[PDB]
């Protein structure tokens, strides 16, 4: 199906405490493959998946070169932004950057993106057409204009439409054994009486990849959010994911309730039923 490559960058200022924290990580789909942390030992961009380890010194030296440039850019931006908003030196502020590309099932370019945030909120984004910017406020219009003047979108667009998808394909082919797999969720259902009149049913999805899943409870065929507790999808730590969904039901009515499961790895949507 569809694939993606994404880089996320966090820059956090440290009032009174010197240089800002800087962290960067690369993902293909829901799998981390590179990182650079400013507090780590190496001060290099480091592999995190086994299929990126086989790239040579030329790759590591260049990604290190470039992530240090990203780092220097955010170092500069924290101070510029502090001035744009006239914020005192006392507070920590956060900058975030995300960029990447989506390819479709034929591995050709579907979409490209680049967002930038300050203090947890949109600052500037490339629009869908990869050709212009959206600025949250008056200070971000300054940025918009600098980035227009220097024609940054054209050079970013080329990256997203070319370099970004060429390397994503490379990584998909190199790491085919782990990146081009769908693991069907392992489902089961648990039962916990509350009283003589009510009981909890919980529907479990385990060991699935990618993280995109849908777990909904139905009653007599009908949608059923009322009484449904639903945890956020979570990482198992072995590269697969987990989730659960619960409902509270009248005792002896358990067979009216079905749990439906939708996942990339499943030929047909599932339907489970607490049978006694």
């Amino acid at each position: 199906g569809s694939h993606s490559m994404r880089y996320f960058f966090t820059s956090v200022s440290r009032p009174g405490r010197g240089e800002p924290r800087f962290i960067a990580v690369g993902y293909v789909d829901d799998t981390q493959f590179v990182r650079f942390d400013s507090d780590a030992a190496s001060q290099r961009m480091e592999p995190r998946a086994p299929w990126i380890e086989q790239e040579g010194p030329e790759y590591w030296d260049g990604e290190t070169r470039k992530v240090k440039a990203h780092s220097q850019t955010h170092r500069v931006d924290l101070g510029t932004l502090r001035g744009y908003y006239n914020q005192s030196e006392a507070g920590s502020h956060t900058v975030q950057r995300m960029y990447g590309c989506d390819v479709g099932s034929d591995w050709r370019f579907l979409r490209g993106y680049h967002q930038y945030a300050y203090d947890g909120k949109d600052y500037i984004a490339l629009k869908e057409d990869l050709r212009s910017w959206t600025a949250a406020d008056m200070a971000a219009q300054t940025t918009k204009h600098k980035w227009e003047a220097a024609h940054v979108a054209e050079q970013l667009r080329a990256y997203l439409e070319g370099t970004c998808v060429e390397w994503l394909r490379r990584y998909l082919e190199n790491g085919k054994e782990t990146l081009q797999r769908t693991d069907a969720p392992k489902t089961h259902m648990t039962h916990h009486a509350v009283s003589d009149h009510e009981a909890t049913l919980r529907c479990w999805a385990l060991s699935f990849y990618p993280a995109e899943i849908t777990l909904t409870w139905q009653r007599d065929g009908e949608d059923q959010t009322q009484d449904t507790e639903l945890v956020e999808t979570r990482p198992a730590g072995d590269g697969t994911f987990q989730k659960w969904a619960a409902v509270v039901v009248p005792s002896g009515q358990e067979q009216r309730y079905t749990c439906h499961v939708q996942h990339e790895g499943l030929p047909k949507p599932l339907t489970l039923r607490w049978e006694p």
Binding site: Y116, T143, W147
Partner: peptide, 9 residues
């Protein structure tokens, strides 16, 4: 692969 063109705000 990372992008080589980030520019300051």
């Amino acid at each position: 692969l990372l992008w080589a063109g980030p520019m300051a705000v």
